[PDB]
Amino acid sequence: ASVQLQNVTKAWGEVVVSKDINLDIHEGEFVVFVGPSGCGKSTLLRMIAGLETITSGDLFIGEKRMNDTPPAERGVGMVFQSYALYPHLSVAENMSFGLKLAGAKKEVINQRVNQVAEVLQLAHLLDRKPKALSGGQRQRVAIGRTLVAEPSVFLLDEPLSNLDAALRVQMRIEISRLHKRLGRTMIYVTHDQVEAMTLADKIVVLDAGRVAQVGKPLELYHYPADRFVAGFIGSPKMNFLPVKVTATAIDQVQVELPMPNRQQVWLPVESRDVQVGANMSLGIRPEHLLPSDIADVILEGEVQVVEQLGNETQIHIQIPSIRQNLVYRQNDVVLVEEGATFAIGLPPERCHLFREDGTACRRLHKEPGVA
Amino acid sequence: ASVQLQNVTKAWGEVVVSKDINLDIHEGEFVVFVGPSGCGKSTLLRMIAGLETITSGDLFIGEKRMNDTPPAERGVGMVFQSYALYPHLSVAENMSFGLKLAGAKKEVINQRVNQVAEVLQLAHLLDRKPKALSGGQRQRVAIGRTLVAEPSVFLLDEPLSNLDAALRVQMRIEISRLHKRLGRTMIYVTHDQVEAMTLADKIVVLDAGRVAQVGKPLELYHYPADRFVAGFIGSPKMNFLPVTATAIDQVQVELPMPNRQQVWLPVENMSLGIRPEHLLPSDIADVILEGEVQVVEQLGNETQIHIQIPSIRQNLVYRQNDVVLVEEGATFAIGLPPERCHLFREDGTACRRLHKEP
Amino acid sequence: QKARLFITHLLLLLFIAAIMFPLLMVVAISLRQGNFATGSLIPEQISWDHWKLALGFSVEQADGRITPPPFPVLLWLWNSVKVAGISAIGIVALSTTCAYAFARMRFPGKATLLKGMLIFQMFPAVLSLVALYALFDRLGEYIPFIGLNTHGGVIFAYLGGIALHVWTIKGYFETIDSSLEEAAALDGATPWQAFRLVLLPLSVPILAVVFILSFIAAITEVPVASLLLRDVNSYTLAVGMQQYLNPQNYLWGDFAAAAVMSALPITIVFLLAQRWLVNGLTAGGVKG
Amino acid sequence: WQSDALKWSVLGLLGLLVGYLVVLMYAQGEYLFAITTLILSSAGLYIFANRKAYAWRYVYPGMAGMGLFVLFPLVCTIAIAFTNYSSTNQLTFERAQEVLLDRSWQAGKTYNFGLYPAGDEWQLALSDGETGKNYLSDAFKFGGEQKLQLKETTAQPEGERANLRVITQNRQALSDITAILPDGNKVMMSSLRQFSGTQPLYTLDGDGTLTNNQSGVKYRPNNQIGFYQSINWGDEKLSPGYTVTTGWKNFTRVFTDEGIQKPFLAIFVWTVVFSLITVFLTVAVGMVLACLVQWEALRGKAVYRVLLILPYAVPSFISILIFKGLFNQSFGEINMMLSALFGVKPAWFSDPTTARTMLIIVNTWLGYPYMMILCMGLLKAIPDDLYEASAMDGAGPFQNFFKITLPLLIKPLTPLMIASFAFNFNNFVLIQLLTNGGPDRLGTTTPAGYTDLLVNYTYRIAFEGGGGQDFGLAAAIATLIFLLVGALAI
Amino acid sequence: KIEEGKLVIWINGDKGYNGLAEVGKKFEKDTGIKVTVEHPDKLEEKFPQVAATGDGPDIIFWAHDRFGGYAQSGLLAEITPDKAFQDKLYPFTWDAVRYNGKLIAYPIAVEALSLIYNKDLLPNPPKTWEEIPALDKELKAKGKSALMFNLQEPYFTWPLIAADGGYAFKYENGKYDIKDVGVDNAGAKAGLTFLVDLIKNKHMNADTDYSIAEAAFNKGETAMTINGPWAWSNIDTSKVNYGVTVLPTFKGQPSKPFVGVLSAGINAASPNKELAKEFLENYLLTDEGLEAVNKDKPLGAVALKSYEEELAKDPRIAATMENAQKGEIMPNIPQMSAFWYAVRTAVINAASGRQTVDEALKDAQTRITKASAS
């Protein structure tokens, strides 16, 4: 079903953990919730499920106001963050519990429990009680319980957090295959940036009770609305450099680099509400920084940290007149020493620019992938 | 303190869950355990803790046997996988619990509690009970509790699993900062590959109870010992192909694809292994490999492309930097580098790569 | 250090011996010839007569004549098991359902009613028997099954003593993580289904406690049962053994045998309940 | 699946029994029972009717039982406290009047009688002992009130003297015959063997006054004290008395009387202290034992567990008296043992403090298994991983208990500990059986002792003390100490 | 409403209720009236409550002292036996069953404390209390002792305290003087002084109770004891060669033990008064009737002159009767409640040494006199 939240507010006394949240999740839409730890991702899910009350505002599921409806009558299933498995019942019994409450046949139950358990690699653990399982196994049971139930609305609170990287990819596809088979609404919380990009039709970013930005995966990566979103999507984080406006054209802004040489550069970015002389913040991603060989803007400094990841190498560079280190990603293993001199190119069309209040000057460079 | 295990075996009645494992961890060493879900990482960690019994074998912490020793006398702390927080005590009281036991000092306690809570960004949550906290917030309290106690050996069980990407980065750094300042042994269980590579002095790969390999982060990446280690280290998974003539210092095999090409490999029914990151663009390399695109994943920083090769049932994953405009059902060709290839035997063991990596 | 087990084993043994001593004097009284409240731990003159008559045997005496058992002590005991058994099952069932609503549901005056229950039960039961007799006398002519001189009436009379058991079960219910029943409700479980299929199997230790505490209460209870029961063959053991007590002297030997006998069903039930007194029932369910 | 119509059929069928019993209770003298059963049933049918009263479905069965068997007895006790209900005033007015109207006196002569069959009819003979004269009636028929003329005779009746069985069978009809002597004396049946001039001592006028037929003294109901009193009132008062309302008289009798207040505070302090120490010691011992006996390292725990609860398995009455024996100063094994090992014989009954110690020892013995059984169950609510965490924080067995086990138990224990305080506050039976309040508090006008609780000293005034059993006084003091223990729980 | 045409009887469970049922079976054979005998626990407490509402048994059997209370409550019918029937029983028992100068129950049996002695240790029992101290000294040489009885309860110690002029309330001529208590006078003081001196000279112990005394006699440790007829069967099992005799005299005057008269009251609400009267007078209170109950469980000394004379052939029963007639009838007045505690306290205070005999009895009188007045 469709799930729509209008002016939803949640308060624990004077502490307001959800403020004026407005969301419109249409039927069959896969929506990923991301945000900093303790921003209110579960609180939202719990209000949707009916496990937490709403202070003010309205919630609609299938165009019916659900504020005062008991959890059982919501058509909502949830994969709890704490798993919340029935510790007195086995894996099989946990996954078959919802069907036993209905007048479901034993063979009907067994057919669709074994099927779901075999895709989660739980076929050998069917008789086990939750105490006799690992943390990643308990989590697969929690998912398996909700998968069997096949609700109108799927809620998954960080459902892969405790799995190995290889199994995490195997589960991602099986979840994605389900959504394409059933065409049902799925609201999915994750901290894994890869999950979010691969699974979502639409991503919601939260920041301490508020929705920061809603958009397509690439739409948030390429075009963040503000400084917060820009630093949250994509990991490693975006580099930020304090710059000064020197000149404006309608479709570009010229900024001065904080270095003693005060190098000037034009960026394809809106000049709307941008005054000459004002202090902006320049954003560039570690992936986007170029090798110095051929580059018009050169940033040189002293290497502070080298992280060897195998497939790539991350270099952290201390550049004078900027307090924060610059992070850069080279493909393959590149032999660099700590303390060595390193230079990187800075591409103008791939730069983001943010005002003093934090809002982004809309990037006007048409980046491939965004329709 | 140093920690070493000798022929350690663990069983639940009859079923072996840790088979004859040997580990030597020196003092001031940062060791990380990795392995598939339910392989025995926590079990291993818990046996070191003393919370689980050891069936057969020897455990030494600081040059003295610890098998018979109770957990409280081992000089060890632990960040639990499931947090295991004290529900009747606040965040401040949860963190200042170990210090309150081993000679309580009013000033030292509050001083060390405030500083550890500051770096875990828990300062505004000191008066809260665990029930009034988020999952990630409880995880950080679990971490704080062990960091405040400052034991001889740190045991951390997936201590970042429920934290956002940006906070995970910040936590990694503070764990390393603490590791270099104290110079104490740390055993760290994680599923995050980036954490594994950047923290560890030594990585241990576990496989259904037994140790598959032990070596340097970059050593396990470039030179795995067997098929399993190669498939587990580095995500996305290394691609595998079911591959006639052998020389003194190199081995040649034939591709199963309809054209039947022959290529020499600088190594010692085989299985050829190639990583998605090591595959080259079409026009560059000599060994072209063509097929149909199945899945395209746009990750922002890069594009990952699944390619179905004729006569090869298993798909081929390719990684390329930046945003690439490719759609399903379209043709795609990739280069196959000979020197970057791995080779695996019928039983599973790897033929040692002789090509030296930087 | 396993000197802690030895010192505990030693201190328990000394504690057991100390607390057993008074009870061993009762056993001594039950096996002593004649009726004497005092004497040696091992009676100088041992007699089986008191246990013979309690177990239903006839006793031949010094002059030759045979004394038949004056009282059906074993039937009395069986009457005690029945009354205490059903009574306990009833108190468990009534206090558990009540606690569930107090621990999981919300309704106006929830906090007032719970504290009212604790207060009104802590009233001195001094003139209560006057009121109780008047109630069951009136009740008897409409529902004879639960009137005067019936086991039903006695059982019915105890079902009012639940206040504390409600508090005890409510307290235990509150230790169990709510997300288990939340998960259940999301699986489509009614509040009853969540109660029966999730909460109760995890609450099984405290249900045994309440059953035990009620079974003891009913076995040892005298005033109310004595007030309601008239027929000798319907007497519980506690009521029946009052016949051994007279204004000037007690038949100690027979009273003691009755006392030791009444402790037996307590022991049996206590042993059987242990299967429900288990650790770590909620283990592996909730991360935290 | 059970039908939806089946619910309204059952609720209709149960709603039928109500009314079938309610109007049936209304048919005879009940009313109070008919109104109380209506509100209780109507609440039950309403609660199960609409689904908005769902939560009350769980509470109703339990609250109904409690109201019936705890609250109702509570109201009556309080109700009785406003009346003079006692041994002296136990009957209702109607019963007291009924008793007085059955009272009789021998006004005339006393004749032994015999019954003699005359064909199908009967003959009644009387024998006058003090004159040696015999009288005999004509042939008569049994049935209803009738008067028989007796004639003096020398002859024997022709019939054979009837059995006691025949006299007994025909006793009703025989008790309605008024035999009339030749001299004009009326005589009726007084026993199964005699006819005499027995007559009612009092006759009811109608307005409410009873006049005595023997003395000529007139009596009227005095509802201020609850007796028939001579008449404007006279000195003489008739028993039995009847129950009557007295208002605050019973409550003020506790406040007005100096002398019953002299030892009040000193006893009150001891009651609180005795109760506090009992609860503390029973909780302490019980919790520790429960902890030790669930400890899996302890290999014999199953046997210990059973032996530890045996003081609660045996009825306490015999145990308390056995202790009374064991604690005897000159005899009894405890002081015989203490004289052998050490060199002392504590005055367990003579000395106030040592007596108080004895009382607390026996009470802890009586009360520890209760708390232990509670803890045995309550301990199972604590997860094992909390102790795994404490092991990783460097905790031992003692540290575990005080920092985790105790604080996680005190909260559920709190309501039980408050209850155990109120119960031991009123622990009448223990003190009576063991000490009788002994030793004696010297100079106490109304008998008070050192180990006396407030309940013990109080019910000595009400039930003993020489004024019969005053239930009205005991009910009023029961209400007062309830308001006192209610004010204590603050 | 008590049912007409049958008799319900309540009697305590240590009386011969099976014997009483057989007397009732004879009654039924001659009358057609079924007689049911019951022995419920705490019948003395149950009766007041059930009878108040016009229920309960037609006939209640209990000790006379409780019947004064029942009668005042208006629960007992006033009985009317003739002069000829009253001749059959001992005249002093009729005094026991009188409320406000009117008979309210039929006396059945008599109960009083007697002196019990071991024949093997003591062939000739002493006639005086003053003889004991000297006698204990020659028994102490053989390890034994003279006298051991229950010192804790005033019922057992009263006979000696009452000998020289101690009394509960002055029984003038039917009416008990509530304002005339005699636990303070010289007669009471000398009785308790002699008891204290026996403890002072280690002939007795201050904290000797019923259990300790009964065990000492049955094991043959003490030469004599003071106890009632309920204690005889214990001694029979012990096979101690024992005699029951008159209590020792004090200062020339006999011990005055309290007398308990088992009595039968008729419920004031019973519709079977005349049936009960016939059963009690002509069926129970005959040689044959009492023999039936006595054979079941011994009654001790009966009130019936004719059957008592046959029972008195047993020297123990004769001794019971003698001590009863030289003793004091238990007062059937509510004011006795205060007496029991105040007197019990007085002796404990005097024996343990908390108070002297003088002040201990003075305070005891003060406590009764001011409680009987209020």
Ligand SMILES: CCCCCC/C=C/CCCCCCCCCC(=O)O[C@H](COC(=O)CCCCCCCCCCCCCCC)COP(=O)(O)OC[C@@H](O)CO
């Ligand atoms: C006045 C008190 C009278 C008590 C006398 C009772 C008579 C019995 C004699 C026994 C004497 C005690 C001997 C103690 C020796 C320790 C035995 C031991 O070493 O065994 C310990 C048993 O615990 C434990 O009760 C540890 C023992 C608890 C110690 C507490 C003692 C202080 C008692 C007073 C405080 C009571 C609290 C107040 C209540 C209102 C094992 O603990 P752990 O392995 O850490 O727990 C892990 C798991 O079992 C928990 O699920």
Ligand SMILES: Nc1ncnc2c1ncn2[C@@H]1O[C@H](COP(=O)(O)OP(=O)(O)O)[C@@H](O)[C@H]1O
């Ligand atoms: N019971 C509570 N009382 C007060 N604050 C709470 C309570 N439960 C959660 N919170 C706070 O609300 C915020 C949101 O919680 P949650 O939704 O769990 O965060 P997350 O975004 O990690 O899911 C957190 O900062 C948490 O501290």
Ligand SMILES: Nc1ncnc2c1ncn2[C@@H]1O[C@H](COP(=O)(O)OP(=O)(O)O)[C@@H](O)[C@H]1O
């Ligand atoms: N009580 C038990 N009985 C049998 N097997 C168990 C029990 N507890 C855990 N296991 C199994 O042991 C394996 C390893 O456990 P664990 O160390 O928790 O895995 P992980 O490597 O994910 O930490 C898992 O496959 C789990 O199913």
Ligand SMILES: OC[C@H]1O[C@H](O[C@H]2[C@H](O)[C@@H](O)[C@@H](O)O[C@@H]2CO)[C@H](O)[C@@H](O)[C@@H]1O
């Ligand atoms: O506290 C001493 C006390 O313990 C027991 O009383 C229990 C009772 O048995 C329970 O049913 C409940 O009412 O709690 C009481 C304690 O609060 C003993 O039965 C009793 O003898 C003793 O005095």
Ligand code: VO4
């Ligand atoms: O403990 V594990 O199953 O999450 O790796």
Ligand code: VO4
């Ligand atoms: O703190 V949260 O983002 O639920 O892991």
Ligand SMILES: [Mg+2]
């Ligand atoms: Mg969350």
Ligand SMILES: [Mg+2]
């Ligand atoms: Mg694990």
